[PDB]
Amino acid sequence: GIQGLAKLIADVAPSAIRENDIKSYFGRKVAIDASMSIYQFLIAVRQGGDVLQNEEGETTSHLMGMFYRTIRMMENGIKPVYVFDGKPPQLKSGELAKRSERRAEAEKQLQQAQAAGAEQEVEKFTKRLVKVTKQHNDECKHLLSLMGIPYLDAPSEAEASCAALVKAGKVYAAATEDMDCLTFGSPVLMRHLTASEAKKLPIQEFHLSRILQELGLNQEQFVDLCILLGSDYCESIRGIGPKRAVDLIQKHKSIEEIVRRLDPNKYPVPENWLHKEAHQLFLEPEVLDPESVELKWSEPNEEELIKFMCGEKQFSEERIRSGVKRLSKSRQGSTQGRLDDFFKVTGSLSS
Amino acid sequence: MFEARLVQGSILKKVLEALKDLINEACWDISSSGVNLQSMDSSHVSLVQLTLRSEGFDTYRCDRNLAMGVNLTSMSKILKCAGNEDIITLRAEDNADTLALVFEAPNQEKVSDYEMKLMDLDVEQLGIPEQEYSCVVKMPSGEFARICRDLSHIGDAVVISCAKDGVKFSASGELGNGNIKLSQTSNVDKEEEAVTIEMNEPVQLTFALRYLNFFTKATPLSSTVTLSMSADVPLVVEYKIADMGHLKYYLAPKIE
Amino acid sequence: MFEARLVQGSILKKVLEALKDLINEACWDISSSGVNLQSMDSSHVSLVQLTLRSEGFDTYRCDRNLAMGVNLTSMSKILKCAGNEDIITLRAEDNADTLALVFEAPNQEKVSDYEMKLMDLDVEQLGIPEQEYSCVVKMPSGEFARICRDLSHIGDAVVISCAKDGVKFSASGELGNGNIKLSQTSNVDKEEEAVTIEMNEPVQLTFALRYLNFFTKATPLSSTVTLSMSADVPLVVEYKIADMGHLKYYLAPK
Amino acid sequence: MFEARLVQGSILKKVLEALKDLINEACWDISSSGVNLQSMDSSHVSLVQLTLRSEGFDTYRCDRNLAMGVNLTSMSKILKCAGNEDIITLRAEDNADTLALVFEAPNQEKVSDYEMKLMDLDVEQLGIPEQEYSCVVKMPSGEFARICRDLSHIGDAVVISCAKDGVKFSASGELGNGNIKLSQTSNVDKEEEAVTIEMNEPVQLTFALRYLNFFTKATPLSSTVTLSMSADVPLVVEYKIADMGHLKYYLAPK
DNA sequence: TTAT
DNA sequence: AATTTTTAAT
DNA sequence: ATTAAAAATTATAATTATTAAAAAAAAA
DNA sequence: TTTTTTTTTAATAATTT
């Protein structure tokens, strides 16, 4: 994604970062980009040395990982909506050209890994070959329809349409691993939404309105900071990174006066400098209408998971049937309101 | 510069065992008229209002309005070092980067100096108004520690109802249903084992019992707890410390 | 309309603290004569015979013979909510499977109504035609409760041997050899903490000690436990509850 | 061939609760003049010297320089199988590698014959020399149980500073900084509360706390503990074990 | 045909 | 996604 | 020299079942 | 306040397949 926006935010505006808890939300709905969840549960959760599969051939590690993560999110009151990526735009195909060669570099490296056969290097090198096709999501969107949790197929980009969902107020947060949801304009971005109860990875919240207050910008120029920070659509300027782009945007505001107020010998402008096309894509992408779809919360069924996942994916009978029962005991109860609905913040106090 | 000598130092010991399981990091609003803590939980549910007044302390002096961001888990590890009879003096001088706890033992002469590394917190304070509550229940404090521990075995939600001649701590769960009724006993001469219910309209709410189990760790301070409810107004679990002030626990209800 | 007001609430509470780790679920064979429970453990080794007669309850009545299925883990946590000085009334309903437990301290005003959800397992009861035994070892229960706690650190098996001088809880193991040669005292003073052994025939049986740790959880009921055994019959771990029936446990030997 | 009958059993019991966490495997160099032990811990940092003299035992009948190998976890399990007022009689045999322990109740007739399976290990003669000590700090033992537990919440480094007016225990860490200062109270009439320091050379050096916390598990053995140390000498955390010898704990500084 |  | 050493500029 | 940025190098985990301590509840 | 006991936790590979 963006080269070090999170490190820049943590080293410039630490008041826009709130390390929260898993139980800290409790009724506020989030919008999971499900693609990083699917890659996390195909890369981390393995059987040892390879993918984890049944004897029919296809893999199902992402189904159980996203199953227990989804049940643990609704145990803590968090109501997910899973937004899946659709056909990507043509500006992303430069990054997909970089992702094609970086996948194929590990394809040639798998020939070198399989000669030695050492499991510290076989399992490390085969994690880079994880590819999500249509059947990796057609067998995965069917599971969330059994819960009654809405799944959303974005027409262009799931990072873009998560940020439009927070913008309309239909969802509270976009729980997304990359920093692109700040660029299309979600006022709340969540990070590391993990089912673990420990504080080895605290859950970190990006308030974009606290970023734009601290930086003194708005949405149309924080996009312009992302272009100099090396976004996936177009490359950045070769001499400007994190620390050289905060002061440059705060001196010369728009992207059209970055180029005209620069010496091109020290900082060479690249030939694929499509800043104006990516500025149109970041502000107004072709996302689905958030008012067109409603986040329905239907009752989950237990008997249909037996014929779909206990038989076909041959899982444990005493864990899926325990999983629906621990889902329905955390669903029918009332939603605990937050304290900010009753009391208002009067004095900002600091140490 | 700031010196807060407390002869009954187990009062300040029993405060921080009641906040180490709820508040990870708090800002102590040290005024010249007392010691204040208004730190809402990181789960965005429960406020803790602590008021240690200046007249309750033995030798209290203060100059500026301090704000010490204190890891309260790290405070309860330090405050577990003193016993139940030690004279506890807090100290924080100018450019207050640290808080010096002095646990002066009164008879065995174990002068325990404890210098705490503080933390940087920007904790927002919440504006609490002065309103009249509907059903004010003045329970025994150890009875309320029993009741929240009892109904947490059944389910995670208590249903507190105020009848005309009693209060009902209803609960339900997978184990079944549990109703605990407490009729008023204002005719009893001692106020330690008396339930006094101040009624003008009946009210029925629903509160989470995970935060109420955190609230009943302040029961070694007072022998009498006060619960204050109204319609869509948070529960005020108040532990009035004798001649020192109050430890008010606010709690947002569950709304259907 | 089953209704059993029990004035000494620690009697029912200490029963459920003993069956919460050994009996998963059982049928309370509640009749007009009294509360009965013939059960068997979840590992299908030990047998539990709990009898609570109607004379110990204050007001007891039964319209019919009620045999409901109560989860012993869920009833023990609900009886953990009762006080040690509480008065326990069991207002079960014939029409709906709900066992309503009412707790009320007599010095206090705390009326604690507790209702349960009931899974009627309908397990057929196991009845044993009990007979005379070889040695009836009436021995102090809280001192017996540490005896199986001592020998469980050594091994998982004990050999109980009734002899002329007294019993001998000899237990071997990979950590060492442990023999507790408890001679018979039979002093006429302090009968609640004395040892009384009856003598018929020489006894040598090897038991399992993992379930004898479970059997000593009922030791806050009675001060005296009976260890009554014979040659090839399971032992009766009889806890004589005061002015009621008895809670007996059984263990088939190794 | 060796019988060591002891009147009260808590003297041997509180030794083994102090030694189960620190020492996993050592040899008991039992001599004719008493019971000695010159162990060293499993991490090879802290050296433990124990002495139980022959005059403090009620009946001592040692005949040879016995050095058996005892698993200290297996001994402390069997020492958990005893009351706090029991009569402990150790026994050993020449051909069998078995250390026998007979536990007699004083008011009851519970004879608890326990036998230990022993093993051969590396019999190490560490041989520490006796030498002078610059700062001898006698303090209450429950006070030393507090201070090692109090400073363990901060970090794992205690400096011990000597003065004629008192002794300072200071610890520091990422959580904060601690400084516990005692005082040489010479006006206390009892000896279990007074702190007595005999110092000529002041000394301040850093000690670990993971081994000082295991040293404070010997605090029920006696009410007084004496801390003797110097500039490069390891600290002697010396207990008394009533009037039966001493328990020396050595800790090398950081 | 599509994650950082 | 973060590190991390190496290469480069103020 | 510090600062800074682009070559390269490594990462995406969660449930039950124990488990070995570690403070809490009942009663010391 | 402090012993011993049971209840949570932070443990750590161990599958989960």
CATH number at residue D251: 3.70.10.10
Find out whether C105 and C86 touch, Cβ atoms under 8 Å: yes
Which residue range is the domain that position B39 belongs to? 1-256
Which residues 28 to 67 of A reach strand E, CB within 7 A? 35-36, 39-40, 43
H/E segment holding residue A278: helix A275-283
H/E segment holding residue D196: strand D196-199
Confirm whether any atom of chain H, the nucleic acid strand, is less than 7 Å from CB of A319: yes
Place of tokens 């510290």: A120
Find out whether D170 and D176 touch, Cβ atoms under 8 Å: no
Cα C206 from chain centre: 21
Does residue A72 lie within any of the structural domains? yes
Confirm whether any atom of chain H, the nucleic acid strand, is less than 7 Å from CB of D83: no
Output the distance from D156 CA to G4 C1' rounded to whole Å.
39
H/E segment holding residue A93: helix A93-116
Q: Determine how β-strand D87-92 pairs with β-strand D2-6.
A: antiparallel
- Beta carbons within 8 Å of D129's beta carbon, 6+ residues apart: none
Residue A307: strand, helix, or coil: helix
Experimental method: cryo-EM
The four Cα atoms C140, C145, C149, C151 give a dihedral, to 10 degrees, of 30
CATH number at residue A129: 3.40.50.1010
Number of folded domains that form chain D: 1
Does residue A157 lie within any of the structural domains? yes
CATH number at residue A263: 1.10.150.20
Question: How many other β-carbons are positioned within 10 Å of the β-carbon of residue B46?
Answer: 26
Q: Are residues A272 and A125 in the same domain?
A: no
Residue D2: strand, helix, or coil: strand
Q: Which chains have at least 3 CB atom pairs separated by less than 8 Å from chain A?
A: B
Q: Are residues A86 and A25 in the same domain?
A: yes
Pick the closest to residue A181 from A11, A28, A36 (CA basis): A36
HSE-up (13 A, CA, CB side) for residue A280: 6
Give the single-character DSSP code of A306.
I
Rounded-to-integer distance, Cα C64 and Cα C118, Å: 18
- Beta carbons within 8 Å of D227's beta carbon, 6+ residues apart: D135, D136, D137, D138, D139, D144, D160, D167, D235, D236, D237, D238
Q: Which nucleotide is nearest to A266 (CA to C1')?
A: F9
Residue A282 vs residues A217, A227, B206: alpha-carbon distances, Å: 16, 10, 44
Contact B70/D at CB under 8 A = no
Contact B85/D at CB under 8 A = no
Q: Which structure tokens are listed for B102?
A: 């002095």
Rounded-to-integer distance, Cα C89 and Cα C102, Å: 5
Residue D91 vs residues A300, B32, C178, D96, D99: alpha-carbon distances, Å: 69, 71, 14, 11, 6
Scanning C86-115 for CB atoms below 8 A from B yields 98, 108-115
> Which residues of chain D are within 8 Å of residue B102 when distances are taken between CB atoms?
none
Is A46 labelled a binding residue?
A: yes
Query: Do the chains contact at C150 and D112, CB–CB below 8 Å?
Result: yes
Is A33 labelled a binding residue?
A: yes
> Which residues of chain D are within 8 Å of residue C151 when distances are taken between CB atoms?
81
Q: Determine how β-strand C34-40 pairs with β-strand C46-53.
A: antiparallel
Q: Are residues A203 and A268 in the same domain?
A: no
Distance from the B38 Cα atom to the nearest Cα atom in chain C, whole angstroms: 33
Find out whether D205 and D234 touch, Cβ atoms under 8 Å: no
- Beta carbons within 8 Å of A232's beta carbon, 6+ residues apart: A1, A2, A92, A94, A95, A180
Q: Which structure tokens are listed for A266?
A: 């020290």
> Which residues of chain C are within 8 Å of residue B143 when distances are taken between CB atoms?
110
Find out whether A30 and A78 touch, Cβ atoms under 8 Å: yes
Q: Chain E positions under 7 Å from a protein CB?
A: 1-4
Confirm whether any atom of chain F, the nucleic acid strand, is less than 7 Å from CB of A241: no
Does residue A296 lie within any of the structural domains? no
Concatenate the DSSP letters of all residues of A126-156 into one string. Answer: GGGG----SHHHHTTHHHHHHHT--EEE-SS
Q: Are residues A158 and A87 in the same domain?
A: yes
Angle at which helices A219-228 and A208-215 pack, to 10 degrees? 80
Q: Are residues A138 and A278 in the same domain?
A: no
Q: Are residues A208 and A102 in the same domain?
A: yes
Which residue range is the domain that position A11 belongs to? 1-216
Query: Do the chains contact at C176 and D115, CB–CB below 8 Å?
Result: yes
- Which residue among B153, B176, B183 places its CB closest to the CB of C109? B183
Alpha-helical (H) ranges within chain C are 10-16, 72-79, 141-151, 210-215
Q: Which structure tokens are listed for C156?
A: 């998982």
Q: Which structure tokens are listed for C224?
A: 């005296």
> Which residues of chain D are within 8 Å of residue C182 when distances are taken between CB atoms?
109-111
Say if residue D216 is exposed, middle or buried (CB neighbours under 10 Å; 0-12, 13-18, 19+): buried
Pick the closest to residue B172 from B206, B133, B136 (CA basis): B206
Is A244 labelled a binding residue?
A: no
- E strand intervals along chain B: 2-6, 25-30, 34-40, 47-53, 59-61, 66-71, 87-92, 98-104, 111-117, 124-127, 135-140, 157-163, 166-172, 176-182, 196-198, 207-208, 224-230, 233-241, 245-251, 254-255
Output the distance from A169 CA to E3 C1' rounded to whole Å.
25
- Which residue among D175, D177, D182 places its CB closest to the CB of B109? D182
Contact B211/D at CB under 8 A = no
Query: Do the chains contact at D117 and C151, CB–CB below 8 Å?
Result: no
Confirm whether any atom of chain F, the nucleic acid strand, is less than 7 Å from CB of A189: no
Residue B44 vs residues A22, A351, C93, D17: alpha-carbon distances, Å: 12, 20, 43, 45
Size of interface A-B (CB pairs under 8 A): 94
> Which residues of chain D are within 8 Å of residue B110 when distances are taken between CB atoms?
143, 146-147, 180-182
Residues written for chain C: 254
Pick the closest to residue D114 from C173, C209, C145 (CA basis): C173
Q: Which structure tokens are listed for B162?
A: 């105020």
CA torsion sign, A57 to A105 to A158 to A47?
A: positive
Q: Are residues A205 and A228 in the same domain?
A: no
Q: Chain H positions under 7 Å from a protein CB?
A: 1-6, 10, 15-17
Is A232 labelled a binding residue?
A: yes
Instruction: Kindly list the protein residues whose beta carbon lies within 7 Å of any strand G atom.
Output: A 3, 36, 39-41, 43-46, 65, 68-69, 71-72, 124, 127, 177, 194-197, 201, 230, 236-245, 319, 322; C 84
Pick the closest to residue D83 from D61, D106, D65 (CA basis): D106
- Beta carbons within 8 Å of C196's beta carbon, 6+ residues apart: C136, C137, C138, C139, C184, C186
> Which residues of chain D are within 8 Å of residue B24 when distances are taken between CB atoms?
none
B99, closest residue in chain D (CA to CA)? D176
Alpha-carbon Rg for chain C in angstroms: 19
Output the distance from B8 CA to H10 C1' rounded to whole Å.
35
Question: How many other β-carbons are positioned within 10 Å of the β-carbon of residue C156?
Answer: 18
Q: Are residues A11 and A98 in the same domain?
A: yes
Output the distance from A170 CA to F3 C1' rounded to whole Å.
38
Distance from the B113 Cα atom to the nearest Cα atom in chain C, whole angstroms: 43
Rounded-to-integer distance, Cα B137 and Cα B236, Å: 10
Confirm whether any atom of chain F, the nucleic acid strand, is less than 7 Å from CB of A179: yes
Q: Which chains have at least 3 CB atom pairs separated by less than 8 Å from chain C?
A: B, D
Cα C125 from chain centre: 17
Q: Are residues A210 and A146 in the same domain?
A: yes
Among A285, A306, A321, where does a domain finish? A285
Confirm whether any atom of chain H, the nucleic acid strand, is less than 7 Å from CB of A322: no
Confirm whether any atom of chain H, the nucleic acid strand, is less than 7 Å from CB of D220: yes
Angle at C131 between CA C126 and CA C137, to 5 degrees: 105
Say if residue A106 is exposed, middle or buried (CB neighbours under 10 Å; 0-12, 13-18, 19+): middle
